[PDB]
Design a protein around this ligand. Sequence first.
Ligand SMILES: [Mg+2]
Ligand SMILES: [Mg+2]
Ligand SMILES: [Mg+2]
Ligand SMILES: [Mg+2]
Ligand SMILES: [Mn+2]
Ligand SMILES: [Mn+2]
Ligand SMILES: [Mn+2]
Ligand SMILES: [Mn+2]
Ligand SMILES: [Mn+2]
Ligand SMILES: [Mn+2]
Ligand SMILES: [Mn+2]
Ligand SMILES: [Mn+2]
Ligand code: NA
Ligand code: NA
Ligand code: NA
Ligand code: NA
Ligand code: NA
Ligand code: NA
Ligand code: NA
Ligand code: NA
Lengths: 387, 387, 387, 387
Amino acid sequence: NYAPTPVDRFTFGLWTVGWQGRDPFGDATRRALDPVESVRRLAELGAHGVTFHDDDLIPFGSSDSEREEHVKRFRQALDDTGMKVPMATTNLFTHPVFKDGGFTANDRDVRRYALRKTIRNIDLAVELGAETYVAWGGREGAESGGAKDVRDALDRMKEAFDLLGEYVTSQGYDIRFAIEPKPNQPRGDILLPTVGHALAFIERLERPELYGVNPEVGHEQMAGLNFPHGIAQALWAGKLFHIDLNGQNGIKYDQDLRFGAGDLRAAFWLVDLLESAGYSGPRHFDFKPPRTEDFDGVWASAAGCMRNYLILKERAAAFRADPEVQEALRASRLDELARPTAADGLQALLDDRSAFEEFDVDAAAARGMAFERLDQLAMDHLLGARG
Amino acid sequence: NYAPTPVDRFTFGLWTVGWQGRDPFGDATRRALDPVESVRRLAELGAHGVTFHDDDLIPFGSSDSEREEHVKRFRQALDDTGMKVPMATTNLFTHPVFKDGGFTANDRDVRRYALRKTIRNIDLAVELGAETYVAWGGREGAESGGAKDVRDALDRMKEAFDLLGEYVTSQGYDIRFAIEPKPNQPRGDILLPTVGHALAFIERLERPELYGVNPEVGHEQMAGLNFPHGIAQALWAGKLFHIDLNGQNGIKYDQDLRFGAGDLRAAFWLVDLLESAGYSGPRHFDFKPPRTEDFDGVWASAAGCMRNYLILKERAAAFRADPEVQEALRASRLDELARPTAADGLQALLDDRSAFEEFDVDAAAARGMAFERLDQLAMDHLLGARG
Amino acid sequence: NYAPTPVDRFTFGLWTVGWQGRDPFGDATRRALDPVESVRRLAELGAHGVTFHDDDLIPFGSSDSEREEHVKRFRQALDDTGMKVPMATTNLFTHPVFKDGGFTANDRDVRRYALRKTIRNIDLAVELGAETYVAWGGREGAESGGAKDVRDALDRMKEAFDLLGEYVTSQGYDIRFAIEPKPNQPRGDILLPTVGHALAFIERLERPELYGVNPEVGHEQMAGLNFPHGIAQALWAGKLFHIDLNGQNGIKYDQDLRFGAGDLRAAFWLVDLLESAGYSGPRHFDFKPPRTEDFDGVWASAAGCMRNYLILKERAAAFRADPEVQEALRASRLDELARPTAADGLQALLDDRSAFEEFDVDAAAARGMAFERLDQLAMDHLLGARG
Amino acid sequence: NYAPTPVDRFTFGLWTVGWQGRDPFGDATRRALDPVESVRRLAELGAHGVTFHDDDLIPFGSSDSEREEHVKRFRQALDDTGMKVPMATTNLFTHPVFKDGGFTANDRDVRRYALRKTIRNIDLAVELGAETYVAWGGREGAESGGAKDVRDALDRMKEAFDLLGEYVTSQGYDIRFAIEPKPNQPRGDILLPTVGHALAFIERLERPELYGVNPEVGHEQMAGLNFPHGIAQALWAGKLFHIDLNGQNGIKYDQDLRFGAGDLRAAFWLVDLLESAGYSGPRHFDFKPPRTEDFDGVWASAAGCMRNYLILKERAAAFRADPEVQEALRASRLDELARPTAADGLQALLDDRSAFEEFDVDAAAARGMAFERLDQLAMDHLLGARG
Ligand SMILES: [Mg+2]
Ligand SMILES: [Mg+2]
Ligand SMILES: [Mg+2]
Ligand SMILES: [Mg+2]
Ligand SMILES: [Mn+2]
Ligand SMILES: [Mn+2]
Ligand SMILES: [Mn+2]
Ligand SMILES: [Mn+2]
Ligand SMILES: [Mn+2]
Ligand SMILES: [Mn+2]
Ligand SMILES: [Mn+2]
Ligand SMILES: [Mn+2]
Ligand code: NA
Ligand code: NA
Ligand code: NA
Ligand code: NA
Ligand code: NA
Ligand code: NA
Ligand code: NA
Ligand code: NA
């Protein structure tokens, strides 16, 4: 039961199942995986595709001949399995040169290098068929208030993204960009810390249509925010270009638990929203099998990500299709929320005594919302306890 | 020392010093204050002005003759003291009719009433000389996932703000709107939970130039975010129309401590930013004297808000003017952060071997940022411990 | 399905279903309930009993004749329904006299009054058959560092609890005390903020056997802590005298959601622990029906608390009884965790080369824990998705 | 100004200034330091001593001859500088063998090895003159609910600490143990997550007098708790055997900022408490110079830790010595808090009409606490803005 299919579009970063287990306090617990191994194992589990940072696929500093051989082996694995590569990204965070940032490093020479590193990988992403290029500015930020003038940093970040947009336009590429917010870690505070801040920034770019967001479940939850609500705002703006699925158990370090772990009810409401809205992009997992696990546990954790999505999809669909739930949604006036407040227009509203002089506020205030019964139907559907 | 002056533009809500002390668990500890009393006492402390919700100035449900008398007495107090009213707002949160929201209530009749209540108060705000009209949607949100379709709610919120913009345009008013984000409390999650989300929403309004943000120190800190960073993004966007100053000691209920309490170093960096950027709006305090205090403690707490701002202003100015700090800022390459990454343009960057093939990443990575010495100069200046 | 029974021992505070909906920003949305009404309605839902603060049952300031009549009516309702009163508590937080505390108020006269108020209610609790007397010191704490010397406050808190222990001993009462920790709200920081701090304090009382803890799900989660882990430590110490069940959606104000809402997986692990350990006390709900609800929603929310406990009980029992789960627990060495490290004693351990010179650390480090497969079996059992 | 002296007893872990800068996302930015270098540089800054984990001083897996040479070189550096070694600890967290714990690993063979590794290092600590042996159980915990039975884990943790107490007693050593709590990171939840939980656990050990706590500023703040309050409870219990000083900017990953950074006002109240209570132990810094820094920044950050302590010590002493502050403390009844509630005894309290029938609750409730004026005097003293 709950078997993944190609139409599910489940994807995984090479760095997810390939995470060797090094953490702030501990050495690696697993050997490095050849990307070819990961592609073949993920395909066996029913994944649709993989994603990569440049330096996951090609060791940093590789010669041109080494780069060609790494890509050739990877493409053979994709061909052997039918796996796709819908998204790629640049590693602008691991190498010590990026310790103060890539696009917003105080040092101008580093900013220029970061752009050249990204541009090289955009070319590769396009060659592999990627539709989305993600940017997670994990080093853009500060530990102290004097270190980073944020208005200047935002000017540099806009300049960088504008140059990348000029580049893809000039090359005729169809790829689009997705900015991944995170509030903190590894920097004390990271620039564009939430979906909202990223959406606002995009509106000030020269070609805003080329940019959207790649929200990650755990990153919004690291600020205590409601991830389904943030996804709704991204969908409302037309900017949900990609998504990163995982779990996070409260406000703390980025845990990258398998999807469905952490906040299970938020996972249910997320899947309900994505499916109801008809989100058509990859269901991408950015997770880390805990360092307690051997390789069998790695593959079990990856399988669990997909299984949990499929269980939640079933339960959310059953919730929405249940005539008792539809009745409860009407009892709670969800239908009215979807109707315009004043399609009659401003003057008619101003002239409408039913909206002011004749509005019976005490009668309105007496009406219960019936939200608790609706939520208990949702709980019963999630748990398969209807009756 | 540290005496407020009119040019400081310190303002207070009537509901701040007038808070009677009722909390989720406790009855009022202070009697209600007549707004006339608050105006006269705040003027004696050196405040510039006050602000109000409709229902702070005019008891909810007042007749037209009662409304006129309340406003007349208030205007006499303003005239007697020279106090101004730069900002006003609507109470769309206290009355039970607003239990599921004002502009985004599921019930359409409540949404229409909320708009009429706001429009009535915009007229009054303009008559009293206010330049800014704040909206804090404290009831817009949910405790459960099925209760509020967030895409529909955002449609209703946009409709409401668009109607208000049509209204002020039609009346020829110069007032502008400022949206106040908050992540949670009193709703489990509030719509537009951060500065970023509010900035992004504004960009989708029909007349975006009429709307900005009113960020509150403690509200961004309730999501663990960096308040100076968020203010910087608002300033970068040209949208810091007003600000609410207070303190907050971590992630928890909205404490509304006096300004300077809570995160003192964030208060220092905030004042540094506002003064450096030349923010010209009111320095408005949205705080609550703790319910442990009698009226003498109320006025001491209000005086402390202004005193702390003035101390921090002095210390931040001394930091920026110190030649040793200016040298440290150059050592940390803050000057380079402010210079364009690639004013030579994309093609020149692509052709520049110094940005890729000839970039010595290991030499760049070896350079220290000297951020710790800069931050200790900042600490020494804040504490008046230079030497 | 999932029908409460008397052996379930589900109990509710009068102040839970009776909460009128006043919050930091909003007026009451529901009329006050007569305790007689609440007893009869809760009995109809299958509750076992109720609990009370003094001032929930007897209006503050009542005459002796008024007190007798309120108690007589309440006892008739208990008799009419078969409901029990297993626990009572004192309200040392609502009245303005307690604004700086009860037992740890700086003013000595208030501390003495708080003790007399509590002693009066202990007598009543015993008359109604309560086995546990809860103390939640919601006003014990501070908003500022100079206001409360915590060593002195702990001396006063120990003095108060020691006097209460002397009182019950002197009267021959069998009741025991349970301290309810909370980290903050309504005070900026509350003394004894977690289960651990309360357990540590109890060990320094003169008669430690008379005191245990009353942990509340949401209060531990307001510090981001793992509630099942804290309950395990209380059980390990022999101190889980009572428990408060509810939900909490992250680190924020005390939400008091119905049980099962908030952190659903933590609720599952809690129920698993209570049932596995054979906890025999009341399953008490300290929750608040949201102020959006009318009375039908109040009773739906209360019913939901009990339903969710019963669903989780079924799923946790099925998890523990599944031979595949038992095999996975052995694969993860949960059996070994339960066996002594060195029952052979210290000298034998020191002499055992297999524990040092001959311990193959690399072979040990290669063994996977298989925790991910175990956790996915737990998820499958919770969701009823085994297969 | 603000020059460290030997009587200040400032100490640093080898792993602090020696941190190479590897974080969850980034490679090392600094070369490894020879412990001899760190001892000599810290001495030049005015430090009193250093501390070590076994594997900071002796590379894991060293032969006996290698161990002797590493210790000999270290002792020569201590002799050359006059630096002391007041505390040592075991690394039971870095090596992959400890991925599920040391003392509470599910695998019994690992638990036994962890004990033998610790015992070997206790012998070395004693030879170097350490008075305190710290245990930070960073791997004791879980990411999932089924992985760790917490009652069994607490049994294993008690067994381990009891064996260590038997060991030091049997050898006649004067060293004592200090348990360092942390709520999470690197495990999803860590056992003994706060000072309170650790204090409670100690009370159940066989020889409780041998064990205390080593609280760390940032670790309590990772649960949003008040660090000065927790230190007060440890002092009240007689259990503050050692302390770790650093900074932490909210609830997030363990930042280990230099002391005084993060929550500056909490740092002020901490220093006030330690000095007022006469804490006589080391002022130990467990911090990490940010990975943005070169070695000059490392030493600047270490110097800043000590400088900030000394500034805060001066300001707290001036606060307590100011006759205006002493008057404000009396106005706020801090003197009354320190006096017994009922030294007259229980019967006298029960017979005292002034404590109940004749207590004027409304007159008592009208008295203001004057806490805001007291706190503003504290702010003025911290900032050196008296006047
Ligand atoms: Mg629709
Ligand atoms: Mg500039
Ligand atoms: Mg057992
Ligand atoms: Mg004293
Ligand atoms: Mn992440
Ligand atoms: Mn991601
Ligand atoms: Mn606020
Ligand atoms: Mn505000
Ligand atoms: Mn609660
Ligand atoms: Mn409770
Ligand atoms: Mn730490
Ligand atoms: Mn430490
Ligand atoms: Na700039
Ligand atoms: Na979209
Ligand atoms: Na709509
Ligand atoms: Na602006
Ligand atoms: Na005392
Ligand atoms: Na127990
Ligand atoms: Na055991
Ligand atoms: Na002590």
